[PDB]
Symmetry: C5
Subunit: 211 residues, 5 copies
Amino acid sequence: DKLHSQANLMRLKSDLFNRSPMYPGPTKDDPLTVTLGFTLQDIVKADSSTNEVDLVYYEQQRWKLNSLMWDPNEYGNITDFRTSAADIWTPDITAYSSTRPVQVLSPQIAVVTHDGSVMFIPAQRLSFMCDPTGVDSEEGATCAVKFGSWVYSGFEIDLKTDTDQVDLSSYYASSKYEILSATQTRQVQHYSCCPEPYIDVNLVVKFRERR
Amino acid sequence: DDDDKLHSQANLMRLKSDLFNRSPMYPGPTKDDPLTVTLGFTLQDIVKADSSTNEVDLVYYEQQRWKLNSLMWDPNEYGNITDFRTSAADIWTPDITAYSSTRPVQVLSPQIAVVTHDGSVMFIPAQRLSFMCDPTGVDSEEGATCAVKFGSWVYSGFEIDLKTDTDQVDLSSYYASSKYEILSATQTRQVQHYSCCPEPYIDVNLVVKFRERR
Amino acid sequence: DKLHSQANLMRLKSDLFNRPMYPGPTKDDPLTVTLGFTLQDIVKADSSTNEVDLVYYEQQRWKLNSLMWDPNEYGNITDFRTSAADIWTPDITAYSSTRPVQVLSPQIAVVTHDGSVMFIPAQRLSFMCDPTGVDSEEGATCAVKFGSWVYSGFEIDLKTDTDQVDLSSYYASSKYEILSATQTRQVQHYSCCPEPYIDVNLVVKFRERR
Amino acid sequence: DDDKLHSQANLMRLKSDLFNRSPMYPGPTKDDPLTVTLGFTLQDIVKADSSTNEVDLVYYEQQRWKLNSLMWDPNEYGNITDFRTSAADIWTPDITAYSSTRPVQVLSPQIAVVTHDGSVMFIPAQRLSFMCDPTGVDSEEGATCAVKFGSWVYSGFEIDLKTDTDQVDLSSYYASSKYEILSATQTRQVQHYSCCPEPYIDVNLVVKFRERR
Amino acid sequence: LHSQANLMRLKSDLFNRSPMYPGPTKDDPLTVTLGFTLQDIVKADSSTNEVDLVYYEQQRWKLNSLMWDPNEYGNITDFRTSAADIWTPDITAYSSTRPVQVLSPQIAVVTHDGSVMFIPAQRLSFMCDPTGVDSEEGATCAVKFGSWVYSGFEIDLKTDTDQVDLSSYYASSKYEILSATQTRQVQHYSCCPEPYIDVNLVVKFRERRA
Ligand SMILES: CCN1C[C@]2(COC(=O)c3ccccc3N3C(=O)C[C@H](C)C3=O)CC[C@H](OC)[C@@]34[C@@H]5C[C@H]6[C@H](OC)[C@@H]5[C@](O)(C[C@@H]6OC)[C@@](O)([C@@H](OC)[C@H]23)[C@@H]14
Ligand SMILES: CCN1C[C@]2(COC(=O)c3ccccc3N3C(=O)C[C@H](C)C3=O)CC[C@H](OC)[C@@]34[C@@H]5C[C@H]6[C@H](OC)[C@@H]5[C@](O)(C[C@@H]6OC)[C@@](O)([C@@H](OC)[C@H]23)[C@@H]14
Ligand SMILES: CCN1C[C@]2(COC(=O)c3ccccc3N3C(=O)C[C@H](C)C3=O)CC[C@H](OC)[C@@]34[C@@H]5C[C@H]6[C@H](OC)[C@@H]5[C@](O)(C[C@@H]6OC)[C@@](O)([C@@H](OC)[C@H]23)[C@@H]14
Ligand SMILES: CCN1C[C@]2(COC(=O)c3ccccc3N3C(=O)C[C@H](C)C3=O)CC[C@H](OC)[C@@]34[C@@H]5C[C@H]6[C@H](OC)[C@@H]5[C@](O)(C[C@@H]6OC)[C@@](O)([C@@H](OC)[C@H]23)[C@@H]14
Ligand SMILES: CCN1C[C@]2(COC(=O)c3ccccc3N3C(=O)C[C@H](C)C3=O)CC[C@H](OC)[C@@]34[C@@H]5C[C@H]6[C@H](OC)[C@@H]5[C@](O)(C[C@@H]6OC)[C@@](O)([C@@H](OC)[C@H]23)[C@@H]14
């Protein structure tokens, strides 16, 4: 039985990653919707001598590919699987105001469901540009960082949020800084060069020293 | 004796050939074919406790054991070889993660597992971890207390079940001249429930109580 | 229709990349690279070591006949995205760095049907810079030269579109404000050598914000 | 000149015979044990940090072993008696500092010397941070620290460790270091765990040092 | 022209149709010429006795197996190629305290006579007591470079000059250079009859007087 459930899963992955191989990313003809959400774990550091703030968070990324669809009946009623993030295409979602390379804290493994949808949730430590003036007051400090594709326009990758509230439910209760509010908002930009719209998600965090 | 050693080498190379190079890559556990992973921790040192950022750095050994039927063999068919060492990259390993780490975990030991003929794998990486921890009280008699949870990043308890052999962290090789002394260290399996999800989620909670050595 | 356009792109790349990589330029077949810097932040000015850390976007453009194709032979595809590790890229180097350059963006280029490539890496650079005067009204001045490490001007020619560094996205709440930022193409000759060598000189004047 | 082409060809063929026309040595077993000889040479104590009780050491770790599968007859190969090869082309032992606090940083090219009798010589230069309380380093007695080295996964039934001498080589120790070495020993130890019938072997590096005046 | 096609053919011919050069032996020794160019002394830490240095290490050698006749290949006399496509010598700083950090592209120039020129830029931390750096005579520091595994019977070292090149030393460094020499030395070990060759880089420096 368990030998057969393995054989089914092994066959499924072969059928997907070895027939009509590596999806080449989205195009204007075949656009992609990526949904972004953030879960904030901890503000680790606020350096007022370089105006850098260090953040630990989960970035939840979701998208759907027809080329990852399968009928569970063709494959022993397998409805989802786990696979390495290097085995599939992933979107190039970038923090636009980072000051150091993003550091990856979690295994980089995705979950693929039979409808072709992919959930990928990397935990990261990010240093970005932020003046924490007022962090030692009641008002606190406010900082913003924008995330988006580095090379794809809104005509190839459409970004969405399900909610504009950052999930704070697992924020570390004994951090040096407390979160007054945290929002994530979709924005459309245009550039004078270019006709296409460009999408980002603006993460706005207001925070202050713990009392 | 030279031939006897060549024979034993040929059998080991043939064993590994038959397991790794001519039998499909194990795709991981499913709800249909679940896996039990046993965790235990050996604490070697608390290196640093930073109250300016609430980060603490530990050095520990993390013992991982699991068992796959697809790694079984009969010693009799392979010159009575009962186990072998292999690179951890040659086999599937569980995605056990420190959930509250603040920096990438740093591996201190070679990445090599021991595989036994019953299909059990023993893998013991030595790691330095920075994690979230408020060390207030560390310079008092009562000490500070810190907790870090370990578990799969992507699997539920229907795919990867975690166990412990004991709830006591092994402190028998804890460094005698550390800046901090350990008052207590426990490791407890926890069943977690998320309101999103019907499945159980498992983690092992490592709770360390410690203070400055006088 | 979506399956066909995928298959078109897949085959274009295979035709371009799986059938003899460009071995770089020669005197007989020189390459022109255009550079433009966008300065995002001056992160740190260390007066104990005379190192300054910048964050900037570096726009790199060039054109290869070996990356050309006719859109009509490939389902009207006019450009595509690809990993910078699928194509040759110029060896443009900051000549006065004190640490390995740190890459902040995904390393992906855009290739257009006319053979043009656009590659825009975001980088954090530590380079040699005496920040004396930074706490005064005149500010400090620092200069860093970029260019090819191994190719002369006869193989890789560097150009800028403009001599003005783009400051439109510079961080409003940086510790340092920018008084001026220029990027100037320069030609040099060494006594050893008859060939010209090109560099772009990034000159930044800055001071502590008030 | 031509004869240089031939000795090249000979060495190319020797490496090909050893590494591509033969399966990779799977490591030692209880049936086919291996002796690894270990020696330490000490360059510099870089840092003694009494805020974290970590000390930084730069040292050469000399490793020697011998494999039948790396043997050849020099007469068959243009009278070549040894060669150099990337360490990644051959099996190497998993010798580890047991009390490191950071990943070891390698300072030398990872290249070994193989001799026609099958002996391999591999001498990696490393910077190691390890657990060490430097109390007394500012005194005449100095501080004493110890670190154990050995296989991470093999028992003494598979890898026997040995030393040629119990004196650490201090002949190259940096003369202008912040710290002078009073003494440095390296001692083979046989260890027993109550879990396990097999003997386990480590080499215990004991270093006595103080601030130089 | 496709002096492009000529270059591509030459590289195929040298690399993938004449196996990877195995390195030198007693029967086929190799001379490496070494020369240093100092860009900056970045840091001198008297709490650990480490000094951090930024420099170019010019490496030159010559292999018969890299020779060709320019007339067989459209009069191509040289080319650039990745340092990972050819053998390079294992020249090491013997007294480093941290891994060397590479600042430049790893690309070599190969000439038709079989000569290779490779010039990596590096930041090196090495053992050095900077006592007297704040005095008139300054501090003196020495670091030896040489092969890690080859003897003088396999790799002979030489320099072209005993003067280190200071003509591009950073003029606003915290430290000025009083003198900088590079001298071939021979060492023996009592175990062993063979000579061992190194190049000793001796730098005398002091705090720049402001
Ligand atoms: C390829 C690199 N890429 C990175 C960029 C980076 O964008 C941002 O940093 C950004 C985006 C929205 C809002 C604020 C942004 N931003 C800043 O610009 C500074 C600060 C750190 C910040 O958050 C992503 C979006 C787009 O590419 C898909 C860019 C724009 C598309 C187009 C635009 O030309 C003007 C613009 C680019 O300049 C070059 C491109 O030329 C084809 C680009 O480098 C980025 O512009 C900021 C911008 C392009
Ligand atoms: C895929 C990433 N994964 C990481 C997570 C991370 O979990 C934790 O950090 C965690 C787990 C137990 C107890 C405390 C935890 N925790 C925190 O949440 C913050 C703090 C650092 C910490 O220790 C592992 C367990 C499970 O995945 C197998 C997660 C949960 C399963 C499920 C849950 O949805 C609410 C939850 C996820 O949010 C997303 C998933 O969606 C299908 C997940 O990202 C993590 O939740 C925190 C949580 C999931
Ligand atoms: C191969 C390494 N390469 C790095 C160099 C580095 O050049 C620079 O750093 C530089 C270039 C222009 C202006 C100022 C420069 N400069 C400095 O020289 C120091 C300071 C950091 C700085 O900005 C690139 C240009 C050329 O290579 C295409 C070089 C020159 C070509 C030629 C010149 O010989 C005198 C010179 C090289 O010395 C060796 C070469 O010998 C064939 C070279 O290493 C660099 O010289 C500075 C210089 C060569
Ligand atoms: C595979 C990982 N491995 C690392 C170990 C680590 O050993 C040491 O750190 C060590 C060895 C001798 C003396 C002191 C040691 N040591 C300490 O234990 C703390 C301190 C840092 C230190 O120096 C190497 C030796 C042996 O494996 C060949 C171990 C022992 C063999 C056996 C022993 O079980 C009790 C023991 C292991 O615990 C697990 C094993 O279970 C099959 C092991 O993880 C290490 O135990 C310390 C110990 C094993
Ligand atoms: C393989 C590693 N290798 C590194 C060595 C390292 O040498 C040096 O560090 C060195 C060389 C010349 C002068 C001073 C040196 N030196 C020091 O010894 C300390 C200080 C950092 C320094 O500059 C290179 C030269 C030779 O290998 C080609 C070595 C010598 C050849 C021979 C010598 O043994 C007696 C000696 C080795 O000890 C081991 C070898 O055993 C067969 C070696 O590890 C280095 O010895 C210091 C020495 C060998």
